Amino acid sequence: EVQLQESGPSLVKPSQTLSLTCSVTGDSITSGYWNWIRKFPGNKLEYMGYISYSGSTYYNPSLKSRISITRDTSKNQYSLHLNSVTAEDTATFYCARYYGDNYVGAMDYWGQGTSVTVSSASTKGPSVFPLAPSSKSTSGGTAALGCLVKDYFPEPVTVSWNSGALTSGVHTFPAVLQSSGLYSLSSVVTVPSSSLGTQTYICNVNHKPSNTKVDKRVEPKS
Amino acid sequence: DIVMTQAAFSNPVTLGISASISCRSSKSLLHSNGITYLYWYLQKPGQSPQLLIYQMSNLASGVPDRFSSSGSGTDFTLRISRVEAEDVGVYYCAQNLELPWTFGGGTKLEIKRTVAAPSVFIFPPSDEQLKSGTASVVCLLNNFYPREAKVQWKVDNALQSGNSQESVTEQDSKDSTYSLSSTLTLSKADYEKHKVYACEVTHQGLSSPVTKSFNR
Numbered sequence A: 001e002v003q004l005q006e007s008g009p010s011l012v013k014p015s016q017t018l019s020l021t022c023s024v025t026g027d028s029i030t031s032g033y034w035n036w037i038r039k040f041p042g043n044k045l046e047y048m049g050y051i052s053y054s055g056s057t058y059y060n061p062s063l064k065s066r067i068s069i070t071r072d073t074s075k076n077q078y079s080l081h082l083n084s085v086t087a088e089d090t091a092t093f094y095c096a097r098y099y100g101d102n103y104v105g106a107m108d109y110w111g112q113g114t115s116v117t118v119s120s121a122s123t124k125g126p127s128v129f130p131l132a133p134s135s136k137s138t139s140g141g142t143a144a145l146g147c148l149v150k151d152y153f154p155e156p157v158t159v160s161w162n163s164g165a166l167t168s169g170v171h172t173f174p175a176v177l178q179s180s181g182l183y184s185l186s187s188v189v190t191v192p193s194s195s196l197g198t199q200t201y202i203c204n205v206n207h208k209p210s211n212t213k214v215d216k217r218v219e220p221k222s
Numbered sequence B: 001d002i003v004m005t006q007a008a009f010s011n012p013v014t015l016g017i018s019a020s021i022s023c024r025s026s027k028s029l030l031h032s033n034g035i036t037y038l039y040w041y042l043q044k045p046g047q048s049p050q051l052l053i054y055q056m057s058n059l060a061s062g063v064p065d066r067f068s069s070s071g072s073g074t075d076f077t078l079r080i081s082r083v084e085a086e087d088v089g090v091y092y093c094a095q096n097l098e099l100p101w102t103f104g105g106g107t108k109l110e111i112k113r114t115v116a117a118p119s120v121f122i123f124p125p126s127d128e129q130l131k132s133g134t135a136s137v138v139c140l141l142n143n144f145y146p147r148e149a150k151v152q153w154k155v156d157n158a159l160q161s162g163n164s165q166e167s168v169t170e171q172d173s174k175d176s177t178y179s180l181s182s183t184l185t186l187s188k189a190d191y192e193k194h195k196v197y198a199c200e201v202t203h204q205g206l207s208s209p210v211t212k213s214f215n216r
């Protein structure tokens, strides 16, 4: 079908211009209408505007004075520029296709969304600590183990287990800001107690804003 | 430009019944051409929003026939027949009769399943973290329902007033449970002042509070 992929910095300083790019595959941006929407941290959605198949643009009147939309038809990409940002602009930004015409259609395909945080603070990579399985974290034949991914900024971080081979019983908790203003989270997995004797468990952590990437082996403890 | 309103934050429902989620608009979404310019989107945990219904009466491709939209003018309802556990997520109404597109604030569909107590697990700090001068203790409440739970930290039987924070998963799409972490973080110096670290858990599924503890 159609695939949309947002890209750009995850961190922008206040007063700067935020720029994002949406790369489209499976469809040409010289047909249809091509949109930007954002989702604020409390889940409210705000339509930002579109660039049409012809390159004409529409902007939400609440944002018109602060936004520009551009396109590069050779790369099949279009871009959002948002002026003079503040922490009020921190959000997950989505691009999405509108298919149809003025009479019949819908915004059907959305991108995966990209987080942007507005702060003057420098990026910080996480410390990754094992949450070791022990009798304090077992119930009968079930043991819990995990990784603590601590003191990073900004969102997002990605976590996998055994390079994605282990997904059953995994909970990666939503990141929560600490009183330091830095994020922390744990990712946990529940596994058969007996497996701890021959299966190695490794959490893969990737924090792209700070160029931190860590594999951490999680060994049993007494 | 039209205001779209979804008064409910959440809509708890039991499996297999018809659910209904309400949306109201500040002006009629019905054009003279006979089309109502109302849309429904679903955002499941961890996914982007996805189109369910467009222009009130059309199902998006791949969407099961259990979703339908009723009402007229300014008062609408999304109906989900025979609700499944995988239906959990935030449902948004939207309009584009007038630009800009505008969206309701969302309503989270929640499955009311049987009460389920948490399994409580506790993790002392790692040697690696201690070597760096801090100590984080993690209490995990796994696979419980309802979401409401009280977790208290007690250090040598002294209730802690601070230094901890919680995180809760979205409701699981397969077993309809939540899980929760509570993390207490201390300087290594403060951590080594005390002996017994305990998280005490209160929950609908527990007949009395449960404490899991270790001795440093």
Ligand SMILES: CCC(=O)N(c1ccccc1)C1CCN(CCc2ccccc2)CC1
Binding pocket: A033, A035, A050, A098, A100, A101, A102, A103, A104, B031, B033, B037, B096, B097, B098, B099
């Ligand atoms: C993202 C693009 C978008 O959403 N739209 C769009 C489509 C094409 C070109 C400009 C904007 C809306 C589509 C629905 N119409 C409903 C109003 C109406 C009803 C009947 C006849 C004429 C107009 C408003 C504009």
